[PDB]
Amino acid sequence: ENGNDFAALSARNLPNVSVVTSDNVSVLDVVSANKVLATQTALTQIEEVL
């Protein structure tokens, strides 16, 4: 979700992790990942975007 600075900061350096915000999520983002880890509020925001 938007505003979660510290979760984004702590995740991004891991070589197997890709970080996006719920409002900036692209098809290429999703297809690249084997798994999607989404917070509950991120999922709700996505469902509001789509």
Partner RNA sequence: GUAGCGGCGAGCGAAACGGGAAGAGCCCAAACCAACAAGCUUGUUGGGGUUGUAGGACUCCGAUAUGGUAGUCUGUUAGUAUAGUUGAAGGAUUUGGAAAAUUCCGCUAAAGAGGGUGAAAGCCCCGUAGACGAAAUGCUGACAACACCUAGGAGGAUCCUGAGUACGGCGGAACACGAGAAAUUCCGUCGGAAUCCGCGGGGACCAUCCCGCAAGGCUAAAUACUCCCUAGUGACCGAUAGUGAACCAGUACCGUGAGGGAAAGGUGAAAAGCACCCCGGAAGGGGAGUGAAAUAGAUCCUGAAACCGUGUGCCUACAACAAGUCAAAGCUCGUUAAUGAGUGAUGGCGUGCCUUUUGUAGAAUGAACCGGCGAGUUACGAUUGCAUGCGAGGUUAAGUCGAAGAGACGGAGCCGCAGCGAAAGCGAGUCUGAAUAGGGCGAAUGAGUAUGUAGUCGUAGACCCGAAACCAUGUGAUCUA
Partner RNA sequence: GGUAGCGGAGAAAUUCCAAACGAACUUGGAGAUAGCUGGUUCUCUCCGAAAUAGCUUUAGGGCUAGCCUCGGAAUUGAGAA
Partner RNA sequence: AGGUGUAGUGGUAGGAGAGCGUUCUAAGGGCGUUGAAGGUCGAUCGUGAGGACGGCUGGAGCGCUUAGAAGUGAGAAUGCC
Partner RNA sequence: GGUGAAAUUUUAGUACCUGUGAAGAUGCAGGUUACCCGCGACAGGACGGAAAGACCCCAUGGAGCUUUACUGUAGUUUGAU
Q: Which residues bind RNA (CB under 7 A)?
A: 9-10, 12-15, 24-29, 32
Smallest distance, RNA to C-beta of residue 28, A: 6
Based on CB atoms, which residue is closest to RNA, 23 or 39?
A: 23
Closest contact distance (angstroms) between CB of 14 and RNA is 5
The least CB distance from residue 47 to RNA, in Å, is: 14
CB 20 within 8 A of CB 1: no
